[model samples]
Target: EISGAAELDRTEEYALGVVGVLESYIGSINNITKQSACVAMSKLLTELNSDDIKKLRDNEEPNSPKIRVYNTVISYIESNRKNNKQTIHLLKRLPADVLKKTIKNTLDIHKSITINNPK
Candidate 1:
């Protein structure tokens, strides 16, 4: 039970951090953007595509806007260094439970994306 809670806590922690950074940049405000962001991530990561992430990973496009956004946001997070420890850290984790809920009220518009990619 404890491990499960800790894992849950970690997921929430990371998600909240992502949402906060995104919200702050977009002028959206919320403490509970956590779940929304994580859900959005599944889409962003999917939409960002294996190719875009690959570009950042390979140093092939250091002078691109996408790269800048990636690095700039990271720089912004690192500047704080303390309060924002939950910032976007990537990991390969599986969802234990999934749901569809009322995200219509949120300011971060990206969370509205849902992935139903064809297999």
Candidate 2:
């Protein structure tokens, strides 16, 4: 099992890579560009463990611009992919208990964004 920090670092790297790929294909139609980017990022996030997701969800003002860029890219990806059944299917392959924890962590982050102005 990877350490939480290691897994988070890997996920961030993966997300950035996805963004870089999308940047290369930016001239495509808007919907196609968005969906392709989202699917790629979904694959990256699903590979992360619960602890990594928790760390991402919990990060309070990440210091690195690259990390911030990666997070923004992932947020866009999640917005695009959240309701897609294929994305859900990928999430389901995680260990059930770990998946539950990760979902809760993500929800907490969402709640914070929606209900509070934590800065």
Candidate 3:
């Protein structure tokens, strides 16, 4: 929470900074931190209400940081498609990966099930 909540300028600035710094490390952070960051970022992404979503979809000033963060998320998802199973689905509501684990799970379910064949 911030003082002078009515102005809300600091909120935007801080959010932008969080996005900018986190993005700078995307290609550098270890796997665990990447995963944790994904969780944190996902939470922040989902925290935006519908109006905020509309505002963020733009590629304009004040919105640039959010726009860039989203762009980075998309690029990461594309690059990490195989290693991206969990969070891709987690964030799939947005512009969206992960295929094999789903197929593997299907195979697992197939092995675990017995279909009754009619005579």
Of 1 and 3, the candidate ahead on lDDT is 3
> For residues 1-119, could you state the per-residue lDDT of candidate 1 as single tens digits?
23433332333345444445444433445353444554453433323333333444356455665554454334323433442223222211322122112122222223334434322
Off by over 4 Å in 3: 1-21, 27-32, 56-119
Model 3 poorest 10 in a row by lDDT: 96-105
Candidates ranked, most accurate by lDDT first: 2, 3, 1
The global C-alpha lDDT for each of the candidates, from Candidate 1 onward, is 0.36, 0.45, 0.40
Q: Write the per-residue lDDT of candidate 2 for residues 1-119, one digit (tens) a residue.
A: 45444332333345355445444434333333444544554554454444444466456455655455435435434643455555545445656444434344433444344533322
Judge candidate 1 against the unseen true structure and give its global Cα lDDT, from 0 to 1.
Answer: 0.36
lDDT of 3 by residue, 1-119 (tens): 55653443334345444344334434344332334544444343343333433343453565566565444444433434445455545545432123223222223323333354422
lDDT of 2 at 41: 44
Judge candidate 3 at residue 30 and give its lDDT. Answer: 31
* Higher-scoring candidate on TM-score, 2 or 3: 2
Q: What is the TM-score of each candidate against the true structure?
A: 0.27, 0.31, 0.27
Instruction: Provide the lowest-lDDT 10-residue window in model 2.
Output: 6-15
